[PDB]
Amino acid sequence: AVVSTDEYVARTNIYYHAGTSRLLAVGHPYFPIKKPNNKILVPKVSGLQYRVFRIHLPDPNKFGFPDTSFYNPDTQRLVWACVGVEVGRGQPLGVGISGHPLLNKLDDTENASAYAANAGVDNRECISMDYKQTQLCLIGCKPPIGEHWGKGSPVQPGDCPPLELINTVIQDGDMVDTGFGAMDFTTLQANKSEVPLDICTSICKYPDYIKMVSEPYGDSLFFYLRREQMFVRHLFNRAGTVGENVPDDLYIKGSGSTANLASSNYFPTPSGSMVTSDAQIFNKPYWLQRAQGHNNGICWGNQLFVTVVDTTRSTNMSLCAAISTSETTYKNTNFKEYLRHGEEYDLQFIFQLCKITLTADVMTYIHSMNSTILEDWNEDPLKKYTFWEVNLKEKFSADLDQFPLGRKFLLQL
Amino acid sequence: AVVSTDEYVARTNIYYHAGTSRLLAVGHPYFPIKKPNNNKILVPKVSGLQYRVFRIHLPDPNKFGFPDTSFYNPDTQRLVWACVGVEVGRGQPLGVGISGHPLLNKLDDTENASAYAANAGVDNRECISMDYKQTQLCLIGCKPPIGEHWGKGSPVQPGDCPPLELINTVIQDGDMVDTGFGAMDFTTLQANKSEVPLDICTSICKYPDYIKMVSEPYGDSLFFYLRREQMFVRHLFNRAGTVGENVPDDLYIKGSGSTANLASSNYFPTPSGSMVTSDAQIFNKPYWLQRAQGHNNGICWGNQLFVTVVDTTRSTNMSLCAAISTSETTYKNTNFKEYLRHGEEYDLQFIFQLCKITLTADVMTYIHSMNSTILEDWNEDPLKKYTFWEVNLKEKFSADLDQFPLGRKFLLQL
Amino acid sequence: AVVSTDEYVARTNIYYHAGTSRLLAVGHPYFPIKKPNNKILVPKVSGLQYRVFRIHLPDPNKFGFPDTSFYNPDTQRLVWACVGVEVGRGQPLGVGISGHPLLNKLDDTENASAYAANAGVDNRECISMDYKQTQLCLIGCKPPIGEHWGKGSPVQPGDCPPLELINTVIQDGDMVDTGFGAMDFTTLQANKSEVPLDICTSICKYPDYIKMVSEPYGDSLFFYLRREQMFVRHLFNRAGTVGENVPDDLYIKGSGSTANLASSNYFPTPSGSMVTSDAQIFNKPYWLQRAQGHNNGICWGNQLFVTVVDTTRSTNMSLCAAISTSETTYKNTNFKEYLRHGEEYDLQFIFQLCKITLTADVMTYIHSMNSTILEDWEDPLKKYTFWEVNLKEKFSADLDQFPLGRKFLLQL
Amino acid sequence: AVVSTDEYVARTNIYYHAGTSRLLAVGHPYFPIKKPNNKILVPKVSGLQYRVFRIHLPDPNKFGFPDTSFYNPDTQRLVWACVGVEVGRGQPLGVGISGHPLLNKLDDTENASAYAANAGVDNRECISMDYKQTQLCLIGCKPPIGEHWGKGSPVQPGDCPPLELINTVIQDGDMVDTGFGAMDFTTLQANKSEVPLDICTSICKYPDYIKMVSEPYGDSLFFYLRREQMFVRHLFNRAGTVGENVPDDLYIKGSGSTANLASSNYFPTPSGSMVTSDAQIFNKPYWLQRAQGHNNGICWGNQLFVTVVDTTRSTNMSLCAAISTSETTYKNTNFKEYLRHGEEYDLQFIFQLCKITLTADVMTYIHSMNSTILEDWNEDPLKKYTFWEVNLKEKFSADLDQFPLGRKFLLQL
C-alpha cells in the first residue's frame, strides 16, 4: 500500500526563495511566420496555448549550504519540497479574436435572414469569434496528462472516422479547448475549414483531472485551480454532403422549396463574456501546505512542472507600417498590417528542505515507487517533449524577507 | 407510525470504496443511426440532454468474504450496505450544444414586426436552431426515480384538442429532460411532428416528481438530490397552422384592409441557457449522505442503488467530416461528408458502510410490511422492464480508503 | 392600545400536520374557451394569475382530541395557530409569452434612422413580449388587499379619464402586475389594443403592503415574501391622435419632412430576464415564529388565505391535432394549433393548538376586535371567488410521517 | 539585507490632517485646442488619463510645532508617515464614448452583413466604441513605473517593426490602456487611423506591478487597488495589404468568389459593460497600517505621489451655441457643437510624525538607500516630468475631529 510522504520524509526549518524574473514571449497569435526553409522566424505565441514550465532546482545533496550539521550525509539524503508558489502576470486584461477567412458556414439558423445562401460549390465565409474563457494552474513533479478525441482503430471513402479517447502528455504550445471540443482537428476534419485559423491544424487538449487525481502516487498534481465560462454567441449551419440523412419518421415531407431538407449540422460560436479583475486566479500566492494525493509537495528528481493557461490577457496588437511616406492621401495599398501578441510571466517559489533516512524498507519503497531516485542520489526519459525550460540552480537565496513572496510567507508561516 | 432506519439498523466501523473508472459513451446527438435494411442501430443516440440512470449492483455482504466476522452473529443477523458518500466525476470540457429542426413550424418573428404579415401559404416551415435550458441534477436512491409529463388523457370532431393528463412513470436511461418547451409527450400531443427540435420531436420530456418522491412514506426513492437550472427567452415566434380557438370578439376591435384578418396568436419562445460557468458546477465534488431527508438514511435495500444524472453544461457536439477524394486541389462542397458526434465521460466513486439487523419478530414483520422481497432474498427481476446503464461493483470493493481520492477525503472529513 | 395575541392566547405542546396533496389546474393561458352559450368549457389558467387559496381548518372546539386535560372546556376555547408553511410547486422552470395580434404600435424609436411616415387609418401589428418576473406569498387570516389605478369621478368626448388609486380585495384569478403598470385596463384604455391579449380587459392589481402592514390588528398579513425583476427590451411608439400637444417652448419648429412631429407617447416592452433556481422562493419551509403585526399567527375563525404568484413556471405548451391522417405532404390547413397551461400546487402546514380564557376583559376585547369570533363560540366573504381548500379531514398528529413535519421536528 | 522602516524609525502619537478640499479640470476629451500659434487654449481632459498628484508637505524639522519635547533636535530628525488616505470624486457616474471619423475597418466578420459596393481604396468608416472600464489608486513616495510596447532594437519599407517592453515613469496626462493593448501607437501604427481619436497619437501605459513590488526598498508602491473589466462588443476586420500571407497549409484553395482570401487581421471593439456604485473604489478611506514592502508609509523627502485612474466618471457633455437667434426653423448650419469634460477631486490624508536617530549605522544605511536624504536635512531631479502639483505646506491641522477623514480615523483609533 502507498504511504504519505510525511510518513518517511522529515521536514526541516530551512527555507529558500527562487524566482525567474521576467519571462517574455512575442510572436504571431495564429501561425508561425517563416519564409522560403521550414525554420521558424517569428514563433506562434497565443493566449490559448499551454505554458508548461520545466523548472530545475539545484541538487540539495551537492548544494553548498552555510552549515551541514542538520543532517548526517552518511545515512541521509536531501530533497526539496514546494510550500508556496505565485504566478505573476504583467500585461493588461484583454480579449483576443481569432477567425478563419474561409470558415465553413452556410447560413444563420438562429433567425430568418434577409438573404440566404444560394447553394453552389463553395459557400465559405470570413467569420471570427471570441473564444471560451479559461484559467488553470497545475503544479506537480511530473508532466501533466491531457485527453482528446482522436481517430480510433480502423469501409468506403467519406465514411465517419472511428472515434477514440487518447491520453497524451501536455506540452508547451499545445492549444487548450476553445468551445469546439477537445479533439484532433487535423485528422478528424479533412475539410480543414471547420474551425478558426489557429486550431484548424492542431489538437485541443483538456487536462485529465480524473486520471491525474486518481493515480496512485499523486506526483502529477500537488495543487490545481481552474475557471471556465462561455455562452453561445451565434447559431450557424454547416455546408457539405450530408453524412447521415434524417430519418423519415421524424418529419413530414414538404413540397416545392421545402422538398429538400436544409443542412442539419448545427454548430455554435462560443464567447467568453466579461473578463474581470475580481475573478482572476493569478497574482496571488498559493500555499501547498497539504496536497490531495500522497505526495505532499515533494519535488522528486529536483523538478517541478507549472502548467498555466490564461485567456484573460489574450489581446492582440494591431501593427501597421508604411511603404512610402510621400502619400499625402490615404491609400490601402500603401500600408501593411500585422498582428503580434506579448506574454509576461514571473514565477516565485518557496522551498523547504527535507531529509530522508535510507533504511532497507525506505529504499525498497522508493525503488518500487520510482527507481530513478536511488540512481540519482549516487538518456532523459522526458527529453522528447517541448517545455519552457526554467533554470533556478543559480537563483536560490535564504533571506526570505528580501522578496515579496518571502514577506507574505513570513507573515503567515 | 413508520420508524427511521437508524432505529433498527446498527452501524459498524467497516467501510469500503467502490469505483466505476471511466465510463464512456459515444453516439449521435439527435437520433440513432441504422442501415435501412435492418432495425439494428449502428450508432446509439447519446445527447447531453438525456437522463443517465445507472443501476449499481453491490456484492451482497451475507456471502462476502471478510478477514473477520466477529461483528455479527450469522444465524440471528443479516448484513446490509449503507451509502455514506458519493461523487460523480465528469471528465469533459465545459461547453454548450445546439439543436434544431430543418422544418420547424415558424411563421413570423413577432418581436419587432414593422408591417402586418401576409397570409400563410401551403407550407411556411423554416430551418431554425436554438440552445436549450441549462440543467443539472443528481438523484440517489435505492429505487428507480419517478418523473412526470403531460400525456394524452383519457377521452370528438377530427382535429379537436387532446385532453391532458399528468402521468407518472419511471425515468429510464436515455429519456429526455425538459428543455424549455415543457414536460410533455410530444409524440402524441403534436401530430404535426415539426413543433419542436429534431431530438425531442418524437420523445417524452420528463421532469422528476420531487413532490411525489419526497412524500414517499419510506423515502426509498430519494436519499439525496441536487438541482440547478436556468433559462431565458432568446426570441419570440409564431405558429403557422390553422387556429382551433378563435380570439373572442370582445378582446379587440375589428380591423380593415390589411389588418382585416388576424395573424396567428400561438406565440412560443425559444429557450436559452445563458452562460455555463465552473463556479456553478454540481459535479466533481464529494457528497456526504449522513442525514437523509426521509426515514431511509442511505440503506441500500436489496443491494442496489440508482444514480440519476443530467448535465447539460458539457453538451458539445463536435462536427467531423471525411473527404471522398483526397486528390482535389480546389474546395468542392460535394467532396466532403459532414457528421455530428457527442461523447460523455463519467466516473462514479462510493463509500459504503456495513450495517447489521437483528431478526426479531417485530423487525421481521416490519420489514415484511416494508418490502416482502427483503426477507426472501435473505434466504424474475421485477425491474426487468426498463433500460438502465447497468454498473457492476461486485469486484470493485476495497477496504483501504486512503488509497483512493474519495476515501482520503472521507477520512479527512472524520 | 392593541395587545399582541400572545398576551391572552396561551399556547400548548400539541401540533398537527395538514397537506392538500396534488392540486392541479389546466386551461388556456389567454382567454376562457366557451361555446358562442355562456358556460366556460376551458378556464383561463395563466402563469401571471393570483392563486388565492382559502383553507378551512376543522373546528378545534368540536375536534375529537384524544385528551382534553390541557384546558377547561367550559371557561376556555381552542384556536388554531400557524407555525409552519410550505408551498409546493411541481412543473419545471420556464417562461411564457403573451401578445396581441393587433397591438397598437407605430414605430421602433430605439434606433430610428429616417423620419417615419405619417400614421394611416390602422397601423396595428402582431407583437409579443415576455412579462416582468414576479414571486410572492402572503399568508394571513383575512383576504389580501390590492391596489390599482381606476377611473375616478369628477367633459368633452375623448378627454383624459380622471385617475384614482382604488383599493380592492385580491381574488383568485386576478391578473398580477405585468410591467405595464397596475391599472384598470378595460376602462382606462377604450382602444382594447394597448396591451397584450390576456390583460387588455382585466385589472392588474398589486398588493398594498403599506396598508396591510399598517393595519392595526395585523390580521391581513402574518408573513410575506416578494421578488421582482425586469428591464426594457424594446422602446416602441404609440399611434393615435395626440391628446395633449407638445409645448412650443420645448423644441424648434422643423422644416419639410419634420414639419409634423412624430408621436411622443413611448412605451417599453418588459422582459423578466433570467429565471434561475438559486433565486427560487418556493419549495422551502417558512417558520412563522414571530409576525410583524400584533396577530402572531392566530387563525381567527378557522381560516387562512395563502396568495401565491409564480411567473417562473409559466411555460405554455403547444398542442396540435391533425384533421386528416392520410396526408403525405405537410399542409397548414391540415393541422389545428392550441395552447394550454398546467399549474401544480401542494400546500403543507403545521398547526399548533392554543387556548383562550373567557374572562370579561378577554370577552370585551375580542368583541371590539371582531364580534364573529364570539358569535361562533350571511358570510361576508361570499361575494368573492377563492380556490377553496378543505383540510378538515386531512389533519394528523404524527409529524414524523410527513416531510414538513420531519423538518419542523428537526429544526423547530 | 534591507530592514523595514519600523526597525529604525520611532513612531509618535502626533497626527495631522491635510487636504486640498477641491480640484477641478475642464477641457476637451479628445485633443487640446491649439490656437491657429502654439498656445493651448483648452487642455485635454479625459476620463482615461492618469492623474499623478505630486504632493508637497511642510518640512517637519522647520515646522512650527507647539512643543518639541518629544525629540532632541541635534541627535534626531523628523519625517512624515502616511497612515491614512481618501480620494474623493465629485461628478456623477457615467460612461464616455470615443471614436475616429476615419477608422480602419473593412468588414463585420461576426456575421454575413450587407454592404455598399466596394470603393477599392480608402475603406474607412466613422466608428465609435465605449472603452474598457478601469480604476486604480497607487500611493508611494516615488513616481510610479509603467510598461508599454515600443519600437525595439534594429529592412525593406513596410516590414514589421520590432517590439520591446519599455519601462517609463507615468506622468499626469498619460493615457491608460483602453482594450487595444498598452503600446506606442504613434510609432507602431503609421496609419494613424487604427484606434480612436484620443489615443491614435499617444502611448497607452499600464502600471508595472511586478517591478513596483519587486524593487528592494518598496518606495514606489506601498498601496494599490485595481479594478478592470471588459468584453468584446463587435468583431471587425482590418483593411490594407497583408504583410504575412496565410500559410497554404491552413486552408484549401477556393475558386471564383473565394479565389482571393479576405483580410485576416481581426480586432475587437472593447466595452466596459456596466458601471455600478457598489463596485466603487473611491469615496472610501484606506488605512496604510501595514505596507506590503519595507517602506511602511515613510514619506522620504516630504513627498507623495497619488496616481488615480477612473473611467466610471467619463461622461462627456455636448454643448451647443446658436450663430444667430432670429431664425424660426431648425437648420444644421445655424448651430455649433462642442465637447467638454469636467473632473473633480478632493484628496485627504492623515499624517503621523516620526523621528530617526542619526547614529553611525543609521546614517550609513540611509546614505546607501538614498544619498539625498541626509542632504535634505540641512536643482529638482523629478522636475523633468509633468505632475499635478499639490502644495499642502499650509494645510496641516492638528485637530482631527474637525475634518471628516479625521473623524473616521479616530473611530479606528
Short mmCIF file of C-alpha atoms in Angstrom, two decimals, chain A residues 1-3 104 108-112 120-124 132 147 149 157-161 163 165 167 177 179-183 187-191 193-194 206 208 210-211 213-216 226-255 258 261-268 272-273 290 292-294, chain B residues 22 24-26 28 30-33 43 87 89-103 106 109 122-131 191-194 198 201-202 234-235 237 272 274-279 284 314 316-325 331-345 347 349 400 402-405 408 412:
data_model
loop_
_atom_site.label_atom_id
_atom_site.label_comp_id
_atom_site.label_asym_id
_atom_site.label_seq_id
_atom_site.Cartn_x
_atom_site.Cartn_y
_atom_site.Cartn_z
CA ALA A 1 0.00 0.00 0.00
CA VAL A 2 1.15 3.53 -0.78
CA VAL A 3 2.00 5.76 2.19
CA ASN A 104 -17.37 26.50 -43.48
CA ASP A 108 -27.56 31.69 -39.94
CA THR A 109 -30.30 29.50 -38.46
CA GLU A 110 -30.91 31.49 -35.26
CA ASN A 111 -33.48 33.57 -37.14
CA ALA A 112 -34.59 34.06 -40.72
CA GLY A 120 -23.40 26.31 -55.11
CA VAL A 121 -19.95 24.78 -54.88
CA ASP A 122 -18.25 26.91 -52.20
CA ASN A 123 -20.14 28.86 -49.53
CA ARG A 124 -17.24 29.57 -47.17
CA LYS A 132 -14.23 30.34 -24.33
CA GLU A 147 -7.25 13.87 -23.11
CA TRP A 149 -10.88 12.68 -29.13
CA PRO A 157 -14.44 6.90 -48.86
CA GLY A 158 -16.05 9.60 -46.76
CA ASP A 159 -17.34 7.30 -44.02
CA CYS A 160 -17.36 8.59 -40.46
CA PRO A 161 -13.98 8.07 -38.76
CA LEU A 163 -13.73 7.97 -32.53
CA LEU A 165 -10.23 8.88 -26.39
CA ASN A 167 -4.24 10.43 -23.27
CA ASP A 177 -10.06 23.64 -25.66
CA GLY A 179 -15.57 25.82 -27.16
CA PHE A 180 -15.42 23.49 -30.18
CA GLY A 181 -14.49 20.49 -28.03
CA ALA A 182 -11.21 18.77 -27.21
CA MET A 183 -10.47 16.92 -30.44
CA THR A 187 -7.29 14.25 -38.66
CA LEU A 188 -10.97 14.45 -37.70
CA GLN A 189 -11.70 17.33 -40.13
CA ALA A 190 -10.34 16.65 -43.60
CA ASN A 191 -12.16 19.79 -44.78
CA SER A 193 -12.00 24.87 -42.61
CA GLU A 194 -14.38 23.84 -39.80
CA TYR A 206 -8.12 19.18 -21.92
CA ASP A 208 -7.39 14.71 -17.43
CA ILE A 210 -9.82 12.33 -13.11
CA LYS A 211 -6.77 10.35 -14.23
CA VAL A 213 -6.11 12.77 -9.30
CA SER A 214 -6.78 9.02 -9.21
CA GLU A 215 -3.22 7.88 -9.94
CA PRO A 216 -1.63 6.00 -7.03
CA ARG A 226 -9.47 26.14 -12.81
CA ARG A 227 -12.10 28.58 -14.06
CA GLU A 228 -14.12 28.38 -17.27
CA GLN A 229 -17.15 30.05 -18.81
CA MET A 230 -18.81 30.52 -22.18
CA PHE A 231 -22.18 31.22 -23.78
CA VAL A 232 -23.34 30.65 -27.34
CA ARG A 233 -22.97 33.85 -29.36
CA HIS A 234 -24.38 32.79 -32.75
CA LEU A 235 -26.00 29.65 -34.14
CA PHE A 236 -24.82 28.66 -37.62
CA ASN A 237 -25.12 25.88 -40.18
CA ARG A 238 -22.61 23.61 -41.92
CA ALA A 239 -22.18 23.01 -45.64
CA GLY A 240 -21.29 19.81 -47.47
CA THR A 241 -22.78 16.46 -48.32
CA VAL A 242 -24.91 15.03 -45.53
CA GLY A 243 -23.24 12.22 -43.62
CA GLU A 244 -26.43 10.56 -42.38
CA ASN A 245 -29.85 11.51 -43.72
CA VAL A 246 -32.50 12.49 -41.20
CA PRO A 247 -34.81 9.51 -40.54
CA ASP A 248 -38.04 9.89 -42.48
CA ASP A 249 -40.10 9.23 -39.34
CA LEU A 250 -39.00 12.48 -37.65
CA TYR A 251 -40.60 14.88 -40.15
CA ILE A 252 -43.32 15.17 -42.79
CA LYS A 253 -42.21 15.64 -46.39
CA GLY A 254 -42.71 19.12 -47.79
CA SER A 255 -43.45 20.28 -51.31
CA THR A 258 -39.20 22.57 -48.73
CA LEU A 261 -34.08 19.43 -46.37
CA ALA A 262 -31.60 22.09 -45.34
CA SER A 263 -28.35 21.12 -43.64
CA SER A 264 -28.93 19.94 -40.07
CA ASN A 265 -25.29 20.10 -38.88
CA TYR A 266 -25.55 22.98 -36.44
CA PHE A 267 -22.57 24.45 -34.62
CA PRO A 268 -22.40 27.40 -32.20
CA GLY A 272 -16.10 34.26 -23.16
CA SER A 273 -18.30 37.08 -21.84
CA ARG A 290 -1.38 19.96 2.28
CA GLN A 292 -4.72 15.93 -2.09
CA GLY A 293 -2.59 12.92 -3.02
CA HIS A 294 0.11 11.05 -1.17
CA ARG B 22 -14.04 5.88 -16.96
CA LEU B 24 -17.71 6.23 -21.80
CA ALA B 25 -20.45 6.70 -24.39
CA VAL B 26 -20.25 7.98 -27.97
CA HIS B 28 -25.18 10.81 -32.49
CA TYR B 30 -30.08 13.78 -32.41
CA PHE B 31 -31.16 10.27 -33.45
CA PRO B 32 -29.80 6.72 -33.68
CA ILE B 33 -28.28 5.65 -36.98
CA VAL B 43 -24.59 4.35 -33.57
CA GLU B 87 -19.05 11.53 -6.11
CA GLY B 89 -16.92 12.84 -11.78
CA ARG B 90 -17.36 14.47 -15.18
CA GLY B 91 -14.23 14.41 -17.32
CA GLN B 92 -15.03 16.61 -20.31
CA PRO B 93 -14.55 20.30 -21.13
CA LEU B 94 -17.39 22.68 -20.40
CA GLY B 95 -19.43 23.63 -23.44
CA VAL B 96 -22.87 24.25 -24.90
CA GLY B 97 -24.66 22.31 -27.63
CA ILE B 98 -27.09 23.33 -30.36
CA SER B 99 -30.27 21.65 -31.57
CA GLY B 100 -32.72 22.37 -34.34
CA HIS B 101 -35.25 21.19 -36.88
CA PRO B 102 -34.80 21.59 -40.66
CA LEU B 103 -38.56 22.22 -40.98
CA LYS B 106 -42.29 29.01 -37.50
CA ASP B 109 -40.85 36.88 -35.79
CA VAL B 122 -49.38 25.93 -48.01
CA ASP B 123 -46.03 25.47 -46.24
CA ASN B 124 -44.01 28.02 -44.26
CA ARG B 125 -41.61 25.83 -42.28
CA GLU B 126 -38.07 27.14 -41.75
CA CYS B 127 -34.75 25.71 -40.58
CA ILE B 128 -34.19 27.01 -37.04
CA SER B 129 -31.86 26.08 -34.18
CA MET B 130 -31.59 27.06 -30.53
CA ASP B 131 -29.67 26.13 -27.42
CA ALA B 191 -49.35 15.34 -34.68
CA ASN B 192 -47.53 17.99 -36.73
CA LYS B 193 -44.14 16.44 -35.88
CA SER B 194 -42.38 19.76 -36.52
CA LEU B 198 -35.31 17.25 -34.04
CA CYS B 201 -39.93 15.87 -31.73
CA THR B 202 -40.75 12.17 -31.12
CA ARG B 234 -33.99 34.41 -26.74
CA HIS B 235 -36.63 35.03 -29.42
CA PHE B 237 -42.03 33.49 -32.72
CA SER B 272 -31.56 29.97 -23.95
CA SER B 274 -27.03 31.64 -20.85
CA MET B 275 -23.50 31.17 -19.51
CA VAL B 276 -22.17 27.85 -18.27
CA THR B 277 -19.56 28.57 -15.61
CA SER B 278 -17.26 26.47 -13.45
CA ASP B 279 -18.18 28.09 -10.12
CA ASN B 284 -16.58 16.64 -9.36
CA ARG B 314 -20.91 19.59 -21.07
CA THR B 316 -20.66 19.87 -27.10
CA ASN B 317 -21.42 18.12 -30.37
CA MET B 318 -18.24 18.02 -32.44
CA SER B 319 -18.54 18.34 -36.21
CA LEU B 320 -16.19 15.99 -38.03
CA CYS B 321 -16.01 15.28 -41.74
CA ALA B 322 -14.29 12.91 -44.16
CA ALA B 323 -13.31 13.63 -47.76
CA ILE B 324 -14.41 11.31 -50.55
CA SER B 325 -11.36 12.07 -52.72
CA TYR B 331 -12.68 23.11 -52.48
CA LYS B 332 -15.93 21.41 -53.51
CA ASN B 333 -18.95 21.02 -51.24
CA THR B 334 -19.71 17.64 -52.82
CA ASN B 335 -16.25 16.32 -51.89
CA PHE B 336 -16.86 16.28 -48.11
CA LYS B 337 -19.30 14.46 -45.83
CA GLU B 338 -20.28 16.03 -42.51
CA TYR B 339 -21.08 14.19 -39.27
CA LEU B 340 -22.04 15.00 -35.69
CA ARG B 341 -20.96 13.09 -32.60
CA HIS B 342 -21.15 13.52 -28.83
CA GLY B 343 -19.11 11.86 -26.11
CA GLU B 344 -19.87 11.58 -22.40
CA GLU B 345 -17.39 10.62 -19.67
CA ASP B 347 -16.56 8.27 -13.02
CA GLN B 349 -16.99 6.70 -6.59
CA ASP B 400 -8.30 0.61 2.27
CA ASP B 402 -6.70 6.08 1.84
CA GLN B 403 -5.60 4.55 -1.48
CA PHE B 404 -8.45 6.29 -3.35
CA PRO B 405 -9.16 10.04 -3.51
CA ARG B 408 -8.90 10.13 1.50
CA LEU B 412 -10.05 13.71 6.37
#
